[PDB]
C-alpha cells in the first residue's frame, strides 16, 4: 500500500502539471513550431528544422538526446 | 485573486513534490532563482541567466550536461 500510495501521488503531481500546461498553445513544442514559421528563414534550413522537431517530439523528455536537440 | 488560486494550486504541488520522494531541500534551484534576482545584475545578463536556469531545470540531474550548467 506504500507503493500504491507513491504511484497515486506521482499521478496527482503530473495531473496538476498537465493542468498547468494543457492549454491549446501551451505545449512549448507547439510554441517552438510556431516560432519556426514566424522568423525568417531560408527553405532548406526550415526543412531541416522541421525534421529535427519531428524527431524531438518522439523522444522521452529530459533524456540527453532531447536536450541536445532542444538547444540546437 | 486569480494569482491566489494559482499559488494555492502550486502550494499543493509543493506538498506532494516534497513528500513524493523525500525533501532534498527548499529546492536549491529555487535558491538559485531567488539569488539571481538579488545580486545586481545587468538586464541582458539577467535574461541570459534565467534562460540558462530554465534549460537546467527541465533536464535530468546527474547528466554531464547538467553539472556544467550548474557550475556556470
Amino acid at each position: 500500500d506504500t507503493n500504491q500510495r507513491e504511484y497515486y501521488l506521482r499521478e496527482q503531481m503530473k495531473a496538476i502539471q498537465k493542468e498547468l500546461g494543457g492549454e491549446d498553445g501551451l505545449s512549448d513544442l507547439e510554441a517552438l513550431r510556431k516560432k519556426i514559421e514566424e522568423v525568417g528563414m531560408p527553405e532548406a534550413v526550415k526543412t531541416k528544422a522541421l525534421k529535427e522537431l519531428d524527431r524531438l517530439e518522439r523522444m522521452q523528455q529530459g533524456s540527453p538526446e532531447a536536450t541536445v536537440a532542444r538547444t540546437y | 485573486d486569480t494569482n491566489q488560486r494559482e499559488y494555492y494550486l502550486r502550494e499543493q504541488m509543493k506538498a506532494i513534490q516534497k513528500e513524493l520522494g523525500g525533501e532534498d531541500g527548499l529546492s536549491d534551484l529555487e535558491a538559485l532563482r531567488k539569488k539571481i534576482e538579488e545580486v545586481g545584475m545587468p538586464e541582458a545578463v539577467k535574461t541570459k541567466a534565467l534562460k540558462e536556469l530554465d534549460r537546467l531545470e527541465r533536464m535530468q540531474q546527474g547528466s554531464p550536461e547538467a553539472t556544467v550548467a550548474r557550475t556556470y
Binding site: 541536445v68 | 554531464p64 556544467v68
Partner: protein, 72 residues
C-alpha cells in the same frame, strides 16, 4: 578603435566588438559539433545573436596578433 564606434553611431547601425588579440584556438571562430558536451557556436554567430540584426558593424580588433601553431 575609436573610429569603430564612431562610424557605427554615425550610420545608425548596431555595433559589436570582437577582440582577437592572443586568440589561438580555431574553435573560437567556428564552434564544436553538437556531439560534445558543452558545445556552442563560435564568436561570429554569438555576435550576430547579440546584435539581433542582419546588418551590424563588427570591429575585429588587433587582427595581426592572432597566434598560430599551437593547436592550429
Amino acid at each position: 578603435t575609436s573610429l569603430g564606434r564612431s562610424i557605427a553611431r554615425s550610420m545608425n547601425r548596431k555595433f559589436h566588438r570582437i577582440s582577437l588579440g592572443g586568440v589561438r584556438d580555431e574553435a573560437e571562430i567556428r564552434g564544436h559539433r553538437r556531439t560534445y558536451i558543452g558545445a556552442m557556436p563560435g564568436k561570429l554567430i554569438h555576435a550576430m545573436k547579440q546584435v539581433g540584426v542582419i546588418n551590424p558593424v563588427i570591429l575585429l580588433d588587433e587582427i595581426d596578433k592572432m597566434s598560430s601553431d599551437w593547436r592550429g
